[PDB]
Amino acid sequence: VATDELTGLFNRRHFMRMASRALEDLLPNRQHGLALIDLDHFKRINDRHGHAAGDRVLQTFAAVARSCLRDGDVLARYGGEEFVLLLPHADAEQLESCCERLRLAFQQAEPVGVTVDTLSLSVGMTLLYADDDLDEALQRADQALYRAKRGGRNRCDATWEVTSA
Ligand SMILES: [Mg+2]
């Protein structure tokens, strides 16, 4: 009920409670790192390879990602093939380091019993400050994620960076 049976990660509803608490505990001059993560071409993989193969790709991501996180970092299912990452007390440099490490590591991953072409991630990153609301921050992250996707995927974009037009 707290975890996703497939990946072993926290599920969305539990994450929201964890992240909500962490945000309320946030001191004036401090911040958390927050990111939304999409597994690129998941539907294409599921379509060509089948549902069980898609499951193995979700599980491969979870395994890869766990190895990138610190003690106290939180990663959860967000819905579909999307994931949400909270890095307590992290700044932009740390958040970007983590997300780039995840991106590169997933690209190098090898899911058992599948022969996918390319695995890649798109990531939208933002920072969480005291007095922010979690749902508005998730919205901000999702905007950066949109830019990552529209920009060709396999990339991390952030709300603190200049956008295109
Ligand atoms: Mg997707």
Return the domain boundaries, the chain. Answer: 1-165
| Closest residue by Cα to residue 154 from 104, 117, 125, 120 | 120
Query: Near ion ligand 1, which residues have CB within 5 Å?
Result: 38, 81
Residue 38 marked in a binding site = yes
Asked: is 1-165 a CATH 3.30.720.200 domain? The reply is no
| Closest residue by Cα to residue 132 from 121, 140, 143, 142 | 140
Experimental method used, please?
A: X-ray
Express the helix, strand and coil content of the chain in percent, nearest 5 each.
40, 20, 35
- Residue environment code for 81-100, b if the CB has 16+ CB neighbours within 10 A, otherwise e: bbbbbbbbebebeebbebbb
Ligand 1 midpoint to CA 108 (Å): 19
Q: Tell me whether strands 121-129 and 74-79 are parallel, antiparallel or unpaired.
A: unpaired
* Residue 101: both structure tokens together: 């490490």
Q: Where are the alpha helices (DSSP H) in 108-152?
A: 134-150
Q: Where in the chain does DSSP place strands (E)? A: 31-39, 74-79, 82-87, 121-129, 155-158
Residue 81 marked in a binding site = yes
